[PDB]
Design a protein around this ligand. Structure first.
Ligand code: C5P
Ligand code: CL
Lengths: 115, 112
């Protein structure tokens, strides 16, 4: 089972259902099960990386791809007033799934501070 | 159009610089929202993430890798939150793309 056995690894292998927005060879975008904004989705690599703090230098292109896919999906979903992208790292970040992911939230005014 | 982040990159006004290389700059936010709150910005003037090009992929990822390394150097061993704001709903404050890195306290949910 490539990609590991976190919930996200299982979603990648189609073993647990998800509402998928976009998929390519490097990543997957799907809606969050507990949305914090009218639109709230995740972009995740297919390669298993536990958290941003252990990403390798050679992961730069992949991490950037998450953002490019995030912004493209946001446009496809009509978030024309903007959105917020978030990575939660570790305990202080509130991380609950240890497979790297980018949140994209929009469809309402986001506030400051960002939590 | 030029922004205050352009002035910071050009060293025309001061900032507390954490790290610099040939393609990005990291510096403490002047209005910090956590005990540690810094920005990583590209030297290339991309106004907002929504207009970033495919060729910018590795540069954007570089911001994140630099951010993670700076976070470690600043002792954020308990974690942190990275944020990119887009447009008015995103609360984007400066039209030069920037990655926020916040830590040194519990970050809460929702993220704004
Ligand atoms: N089956 C699941 C389990 C979690 N999730 C979402 O994954 C996200 C994980 O983000 P954090 O690791 O930053 O908490 C949460 O927003 C959670 O609602 C999901 O969308 N589907
Ligand atoms: Cl901002």
């Amino acid at each position: 089972r490539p990609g590991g056995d976190t919930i996200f690894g299982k979603i990648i292998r189609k073993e647990i259902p998800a509402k998928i927005i976009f998929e390519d060879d490097r990543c997957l975008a799907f809606h969050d099960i507990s949305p914090q904004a009218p639109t709230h989705f995740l972009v995740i690599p297919k390669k298993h990386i536990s958290q941003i703090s252990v990403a390798e230098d050679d992961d730069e292109s992949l991490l950037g791809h998450l953002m490019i896919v995030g912004k493209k999906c946001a446009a496809d979903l009509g978030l024309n007033k903007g959105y917020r992208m978030v990575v939660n790292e570790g305990s202080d970040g509130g991380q609950s799934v240890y497979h790297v992911h980018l949140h994209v939230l929009g469809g309402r005014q986001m506030h400051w501070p960002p939590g």
